[PDB]
Amino acid sequence: SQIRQNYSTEVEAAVNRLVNLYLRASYTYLSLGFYFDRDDVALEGVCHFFRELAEEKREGAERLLKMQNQRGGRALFQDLQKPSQDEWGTTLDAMKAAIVLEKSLNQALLDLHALGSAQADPHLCDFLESHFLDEEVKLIKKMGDHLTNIQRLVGSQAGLGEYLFERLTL
Amino acid sequence: SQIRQNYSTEVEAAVNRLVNLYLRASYTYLSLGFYFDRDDVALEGVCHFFRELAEEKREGAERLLKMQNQRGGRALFQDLQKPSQDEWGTTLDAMKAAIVLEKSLNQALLDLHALGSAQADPHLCDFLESHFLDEEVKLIKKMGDHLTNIQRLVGSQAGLGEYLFERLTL
Amino acid sequence: SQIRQNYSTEVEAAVNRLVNLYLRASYTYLSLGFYFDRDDVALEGVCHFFRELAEEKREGAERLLKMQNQRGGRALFQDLQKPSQDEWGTTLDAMKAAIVLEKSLNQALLDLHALGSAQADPHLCDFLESHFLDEEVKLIKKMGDHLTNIQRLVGSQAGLGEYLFERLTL
Amino acid sequence: SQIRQNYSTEVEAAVNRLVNLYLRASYTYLSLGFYFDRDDVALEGVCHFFRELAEEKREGAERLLKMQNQRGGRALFQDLQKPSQDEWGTTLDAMKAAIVLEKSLNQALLDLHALGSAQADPHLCDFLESHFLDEEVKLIKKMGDHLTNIQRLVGSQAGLGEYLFERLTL
Ligand SMILES: [Cl-]
Ligand SMILES: [Cl-]
Ligand SMILES: [Cl-]
Ligand SMILES: [Cl-]
Ligand SMILES: [Fe+3]
Ligand SMILES: [Fe+3]
Ligand SMILES: [Fe+3]
Ligand SMILES: [Fe+3]
Ligand SMILES: [Fe+3]
Ligand SMILES: [Fe+3]
Ligand SMILES: [Fe+3]
Ligand SMILES: [Fe+3]
Ligand SMILES: [Fe+3]
Ligand SMILES: [Fe+3]
Ligand SMILES: [Fe+3]
Ligand SMILES: [Fe+3]
Ligand SMILES: [Fe+3]
Ligand SMILES: [Fe+3]
Ligand SMILES: [Fe+3]
Ligand SMILES: [Fe+3]
Ligand SMILES: [Fe+3]
Ligand SMILES: [Fe+3]
Ligand SMILES: [Fe+3]
Ligand SMILES: [Fe+3]
Ligand SMILES: [Fe+3]
Ligand SMILES: [Fe+3]
Ligand SMILES: [O]
Ligand SMILES: [O]
Ligand SMILES: [O]
Ligand SMILES: [O]
């Protein structure tokens, strides 16, 4: 590559794997979204929340791919595994699965940051800082908040709690 | 008829019966609507939902009648039977009765489509496709959703659930 | 399902497979798009054309999933295979691969239409008619046109032809 | 200096040398710009591209000088060497010389970042991250793209290719 400079093969590979993880996450959110749109689940606000996250994760992958091209790396795509479940249980179960997912993306972002630091690649480090690490921290906080409110609600009267959360928070 | 072309007597008759079914449905919804406006039921949002459906069904009948005239068929009207109940129970009972009603209209629309197909009447088929079959599918989905939410709500505290559904969904 | 009516398991399954094919197509277009954004390929208009198609195919899948929920079917997601190539050659090679892809989606849409017809499912038939079959026909025509123009251009002076196509058509 | 804090003499010196390199680059671009404005070269779009880069590099130097004052360092200016050529050959030759130049600025920015990291100077590191490293990466990508397009064009018919690039890309 005429342009490639200070961009290790190790970072390039890790960026490709991070793209796969974000597309996998987007796919998980698409599945969570359409589950909550089932006539026998019918929580539109929960569906809308997850459809929006499917879009953000897809945009995450696209920014990574653009960055990969800008540094002179080569995008390589792999099979995208299907989501870990076909049915996602209650809003509580789903929001728990979403926090697990986001923390695993976050950890992957931190691992890549560590690698960039080890390879003295400040451009990589700054690009993760600017566009990924703060968004993940904010999102995980918002999910933790939602989780707390769902739990407080689904003490007695679980059905009533799920409905009220969907109507008044989402 | 100077204009009538490729329009069987079998289709004409079935269109007249479909008009009767839509007017009967409109009448059912008028009765459901005013039941929920009773001072001893007093669920305004439920009343408004059914009054709106009374209007859509009436419009359904009018489009069918207009189509019948456009093809050179002859509208024939019959007695309209009164609704199947005088009192409609809870929001849950009503929404169940409404889904039963809509599925019976839907089936009548499918039977007429089958007949149009058998008679090689693509105009009839397209007119049902365009104006009736998709609307019924969307409406039945919306009713199934409402039904799911009512059920989730009326676990314990049935009165509280019915109130919240009316206030926050309808 | 309280709502499901005239929706065979055979159609439900075929809809799920069609969703997989559209997501696979979207993924192919994402890969074609970022290939043309490589510093050593650098045909921005070609990149933009394929990124737009990635978005349309994703929207295709989402409309199918919404329809599946509306009929009372159950979305099931599978692994998404990676695109058939990692590097896509010239604009000519890419546009040929895109036409092959679209014709395979089109054929899948026709097969599903045939099945809907066999199962007397006019709602399915109309939904494919309205939202998929005409778009595919228009898109394939636009790709055939592009292909003809690329070929006319890359007689002698292949590099000059590819550049001019990107600048003046895309 | 009353204000100077955590700002090593090693960083101060390196900032002064980086200022010299950016002013030298600005001067190179001024020379490239006016070469392409010669009546016997007459590629206005190429002239405009390089004049714009002369301005960006000058602005780069000014931001560095402002930063040097903000940290309590002392700007020191040195002789600015004249550009490495008096005539710059074809658009292809010029864009190659420009990529070489930018990569040498980029490397200087990375070396300074490394030094800031070694000296535990996070303000320096963040200031380079924010205002210099991403701009260089984007610019080098844009130059690599331009280079690819020029090369594709100047296969046969070099004169025709240079003209078309200037008219339709720049
Ligand atoms: Cl290097
Ligand atoms: Cl006739
Ligand atoms: Cl059935
Ligand atoms: Cl100090
Ligand atoms: Fe959105
Ligand atoms: Fe966003
Ligand atoms: Fe968004
Ligand atoms: Fe967005
Ligand atoms: Fe940093
Ligand atoms: Fe930083
Ligand atoms: Fe109205
Ligand atoms: Fe209407
Ligand atoms: Fe209306
Ligand atoms: Fe109206
Ligand atoms: Fe038809
Ligand atoms: Fe778009
Ligand atoms: Fe679209
Ligand atoms: Fe679009
Ligand atoms: Fe769109
Ligand atoms: Fe049809
Ligand atoms: Fe049709
Ligand atoms: Fe300017
Ligand atoms: Fe500027
Ligand atoms: Fe400027
Ligand atoms: Fe400026
Ligand atoms: Fe830092
Ligand atoms: O977004
Ligand atoms: O309506
Ligand atoms: O779209
Ligand atoms: O600038």
Short mmCIF file of N, CA and C and ligand atoms in Angstrom, two decimals, chain D residues 52 55-56 59 63, ligand 30:
data_model
loop_
_atom_site.label_atom_id
_atom_site.label_comp_id
_atom_site.label_asym_id
_atom_site.label_seq_id
_atom_site.Cartn_x
_atom_site.Cartn_y
_atom_site.Cartn_z
N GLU D 52 -4.48 25.20 -1.98
CA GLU D 52 -5.24 24.90 -0.79
C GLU D 52 -4.36 24.18 0.25
N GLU D 55 -2.02 26.51 2.12
CA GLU D 55 -2.77 27.19 3.18
C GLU D 55 -2.96 26.27 4.40
N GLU D 56 -3.39 25.01 4.20
CA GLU D 56 -3.55 24.11 5.36
C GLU D 56 -2.25 23.91 6.13
N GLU D 59 -1.53 26.87 8.23
CA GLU D 59 -2.41 26.86 9.38
C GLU D 59 -1.97 25.84 10.43
N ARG D 63 -1.13 26.76 14.32
CA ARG D 63 -1.71 26.08 15.47
C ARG D 63 -0.60 25.57 16.39
O O E 30 -8.08 25.77 6.32
#
